[PDB]
């Protein structure tokens, strides 16, 4: 109806309704009164000029009042007047800067000096946890933010519908020289190119893909070719195994694996004109492959194998052990007198596992 200080008759939406005392103050009397309080009075004098309802000699309501009054003070005062309000509040009330919170839902900023761990945004009126800033719900009560954050990501239907594709995407590819983490699946292609440092490496074992005449490995027979050297438990080799034999290594060590979902939805980064377009794998998803394609299901099996440091050499036949001996020990094996095939096999196996460790830079877990 009219301003409670000067009587000027304005509509209700043309004045400032003080959220505490419910008084309608004209924009001019509001501004002039509060600044002169900053100018020559004290901060306990920041009460409504008409009424006086905020008791400033009372440490009960002092902080929640300035929290709400700060909003209207920001919109009505000048920049220098608003700065003295924070300086005097810091130097006379809090002995520190006020806790300013940004509502993640509507982008509003406000002072929050209450003891509760949940805060109500004065603008959108939604409540959120002060630490993790996610939307507050009853499930968060008595639970750490991580527990709560993991609980929502775990039961969001869109996340669960992706299936094992998320596990493949989440296990990142870290460039061994520039340390950039790409967080992509591998599929069937091991030769990785890093955009930042141009390093070429194997995404399964992080060994270098050497250019022509650059490989320094002794007894390398493809020095004039682009190539890398891989440990025996690198996906580069284990991708050639059938899913059945990969599962047998997991079963021999009591490691569980999915074969049904918990084309292929695994996201790949295809290069388009100026940019990368995330195009899904989309290849056939056979039964027993947990909703993935074959290459992505084998990658999933191998990362389980690598995470548990399972040794594929435990399943090698004699000819496999002989290949492994020449590849990694650089000696052609040969049976000795009195040895039957199992004894020969047991000897080659013991020497290989003692001298050649599993992938030393393979990402495990």
């Amino acid at each position: 109806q009219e301003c409670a200080v000067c009587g000027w008759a304005l509509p209700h939406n043309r004045m400032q309704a003080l959220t505490s005392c419910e008084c309608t103050i004209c924009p001019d009397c509001f501004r002039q009164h509060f600044t002169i309080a900053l100018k020559e009075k004290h901060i306990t004098d920041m009460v409504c000029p008409a009424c006086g309802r905020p008791d400033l000699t009372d440490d009960t309501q002092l902080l929640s009042y300035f929290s709400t009054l700060d909003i209207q003070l920001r919109e009505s005062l000048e920049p220098d007047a608003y700065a003295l309000f924070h300086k005097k509040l810091t130097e006379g009330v809090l002995m520190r800067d006020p806790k300013f919170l940004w509502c993640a839902q509507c982008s509003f900023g406000f002072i929050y000096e209450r003891e509760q761990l949940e805060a109500t945004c004065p603008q959108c009126h939604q409540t959120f946890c002060v630490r993790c800033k996610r939307q507050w719900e009853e499930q968060h009560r008595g639970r750490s933010c991580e527990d709560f954050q993991n609980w929502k990501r775990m039961n969001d239907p869109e996340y669960q519908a992706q299936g094992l594709a998320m596990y493949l995407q989440e296990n990142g590819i870290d460039c061994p020289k520039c340390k950039f983490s790409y967080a992509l699946a591998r599929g069937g292609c091991m030769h990785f190119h890093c955009t930042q440092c141009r390093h070429q490496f194997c995404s399964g074992c992080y060994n270098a893909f050497y250019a022509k005449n650059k490989c320094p490995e002794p007894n390398c027979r493809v020095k004039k070719s682009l190539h890398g050297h891989h440990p025996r438990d690198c996906l580069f080799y284990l991708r050639d195994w059938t899913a059945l034999r990969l599962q047998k290594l997991l079963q021999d060590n009591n490691v569980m694996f999915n074969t049904e979902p918990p084309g292929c939805r695994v996201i790949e980064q295809k290069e388009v004109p100026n940019g990368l377009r995330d195009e899904a794998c989309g290849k056939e998803t056979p039964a027993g492959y947990a909703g993935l394609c074959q290459a992505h299901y084998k990658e999933y099996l191998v990362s389980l194998i690598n995470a548990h440091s399972l040794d594929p050499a435990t399943l090698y036949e004699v000819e496999e052990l002989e290949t492994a001996t020449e590849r990694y020990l650089h000696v052609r094996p040969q049976p000795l007198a009195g040895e039957d095939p199992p004894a020969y096999q047991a000897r080659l196996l013991q020497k290989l596992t003692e001298e050649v460790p599993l992938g030393q830079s393979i990402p495990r877990r």
Partner: nanobody, 120 residues
Framework: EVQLLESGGGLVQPGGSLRLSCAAS????????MAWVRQAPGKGLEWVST????????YYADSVKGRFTISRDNSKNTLYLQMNSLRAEDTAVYYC?????????????WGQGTLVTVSS
């Protein structure tokens, strides 16, 4: 009017350290928060860190927590960013920015920018 001048950028070896500074003018320094944002190749702006008017509260993006320290000297109207254990992904123009309390604008002005490159 608001004026901000970043200084300290350069070429850094991996894992090296660098200290950026920012001289401010044209507003009451101690009345506002200050922030660092950065532009990586091909991107816009990524928030890095924010410091409260007198340094009570310091905030950091996840990717820099434990590696960067923000600080301010109000007696000189200067903002600092101490950058340790730099990686290639930290390569960016680093911008000084004057904080704000207005809705949806944690800062309303940002400076010229000083370029930091991390070799590989």
């Amino acid at each position: 009017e608001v004026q901000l001048l970043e200084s300290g950028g350069g070429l850094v070896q991996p894992g090296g350290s660098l200290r950026l500074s920012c001289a401010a003018s044209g507003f009451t320094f101690r009345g506002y928060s200050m922030a660092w944002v950065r532009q990586a190749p091909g991107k816009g702006l990524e928030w890095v860190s924010t410091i409260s008017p007198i340094g009570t509260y310091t905030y950091y993006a996840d990717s820099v927590k434990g590696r960067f320290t923000i600080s301010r000297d109000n007696s000189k109207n200067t903002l600092y960013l101490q950058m340790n254990s730099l990686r290639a992904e930290d390569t960016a123009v680093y911008y000084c920015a004057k904080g704000s309390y207005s809705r949806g604008t944690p800062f309303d002005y940002w400076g010229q920018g000083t370029l930091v490159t991390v070799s590989s």
